[PDB]
């Protein structure tokens, strides 16, 4: 520690002072130590670059060897993915995928199915639904009075596309693009058009059913639960120390948490779009304290 | 290539932000503070 | 909870004990 | 990764 302080105080400032660039640019007076430092930088860069080349290229050859040793129309598959993407994401939310190339340039994926999901172009009402097991589907189809190779091939190419998307999600970034006429339409629809009869019915519930029970809930669970918008009620305590939710599914329906004070709590509470009210007391509740 | 014609005259610090009163108002502001100078 | 250090200092603390 | 809205990459 005694030598470390002297190191930090004198050597590194003088190391930069010798490595300063008022004499570096003049190549006609480069000393031997300057050339040694240049060689050190070049060798470090060579080591790092070759190491990352080997580290990047190793799993590619690994998967190539795995595939070598291991070794319903495409329009219909695209339409089935289209139906699932129409089910999943709301209208007015586009997602572009960029793939990280080995050289270092981000390439545009024009074949991503999040690029043109919402853009337009008896048995097939069943082929576009993979949400019920094949055993139940066959048992029910016999009860209907009516092809197993079709479902087998659907399963095979489904798992193929699943593994390909798992492969392509490793080195990729994503960019969202919005459709503001649709954002404004959802604004008019569910923010000024939110006509729920529960305008201010959140705290008087606490006051009435004081004689109920609430168990304890964690914090980061509450944040991760509010990010996915599973909460339609957030009721604060006056002193920013406690919470009483009235949650929309499960049992019991109301909990207790305690909160550390951060603005991003306000940001996430508003980002989820959850109603906010205020539980106001008398003075006699604070006066008997 | 569109803003650059004005930005070349807007690279000159920020006078529009500096200008916020009149000349007479600024003169009154100058003359009405303390007599240190 | 709230400790009273001499020369009049009230220090806030963790839960208790 | 996070969210990388157009104007980060375009401009």
């Amino acid at each position: 520690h005694h030598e470390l302080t002297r190191f930090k105080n004198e050597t590194v400032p003088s190391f930069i002072d010798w490595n300063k660039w008022e004499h570096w640019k003049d190549i006609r007076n480069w000393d031997g130590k300057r050339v040694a430092a240049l060689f050190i930088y070049a060798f470090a860069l060579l080591l790092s670059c070759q190491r990352v080349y080997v580290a990047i290229q190793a799993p590619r050859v690994e998967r190539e060897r795995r595939e070598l040793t291991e070794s319903p129309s495409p329009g219909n598959i695209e339409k089935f993915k289209r139906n699932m993407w129409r089910k999943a994401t709301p209208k007015g939310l586009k997602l572009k995928r960029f793939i990280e190339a080995p050289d270092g340039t981000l390439v545009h994926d024009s074949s991503y199915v999040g690029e043109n999901a919402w853009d337009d172009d008896l048995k097939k009402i069943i082929g576009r639904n993979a949400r019920i097991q094949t055993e139940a589907k066959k048992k029910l189809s016999q009860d209907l009075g009516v092809w197993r190779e079709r479902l087998a091939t659907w399963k095979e190419m489904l798992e193929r596309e699943k593994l390909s998307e798992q492969l392509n999600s490793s080195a990729a970034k994503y960019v969202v693009e919005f459709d503001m006429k649709e954002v404004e339409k959802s604004l008019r629809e569910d923010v000024i058009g939110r006509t729920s009869e529960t305008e201010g019915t959140r705290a008087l519930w606490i006051s009435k059913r004081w004689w109920r029970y609430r168990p304890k809930l964690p914090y980061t669970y509450f944040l991760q639960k509010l990010d996915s918008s599973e909460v339609a009620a957030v009721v604060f305590t006056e002193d920013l120390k406690r919470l009483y939710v009235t949650m929309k599914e499960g049992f019991p329906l109301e909990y207790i948490v305690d909160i550390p004070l951060d603005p991003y709590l306000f940001e996430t509470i508003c980002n989820a779009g959850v109603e906010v009210d205020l539980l106001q007391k008398r003075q006699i509740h604070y006066f008997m304290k | 290539x569109x803003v650059x014609x004005x930005l070349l005259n807007x690279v000159f610090x920020x006078x529009x932000l500096x200008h916020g009163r009149x000349x007479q108002x600024x003169x009154x502001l100058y003359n009405l503070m303390x007599x240190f100078x | 909870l709230t400790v009273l250090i001499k020369r009049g200092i009230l220090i806030l603390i963790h839960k208790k004990a | 990764x996070x969210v990388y809205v157009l104007v980060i990459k375009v401009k």
Binding site: - | X6, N9, X10, X15, X16, X18, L29, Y30, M33 | - | -
Partner: protein, 67 residues
């Protein structure tokens, strides 16, 4: 009537920076042997919006004598 005090109970450091930046932006230097400089369309548009080029109807030189 109109009265004033040279000794207000106001803030002190804010007045110091007000006066210092007033000196830094103007000083005392005037000039006469200079010509007008045409502003960019942004500056002209904003001054039109604030109405700086609105002409002096307030003074009774000849602006309000006829009306």
């Amino acid at each position: 009537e109109i009265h004033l005090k040279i000794v207000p109970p106001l803030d002190k450091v804010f007045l110091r920076w007000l006066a210092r930046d007033l000196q830094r932006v103007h000083g005392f230097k005037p000039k006469n042997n200079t010509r007008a400089i045409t502003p960019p369309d942004s500056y002209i548009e904003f001054m039109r919006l604030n109405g700086s080029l609105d002409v002096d109807l307030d003074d009774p030189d000849l602006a309000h004598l006829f009306k």
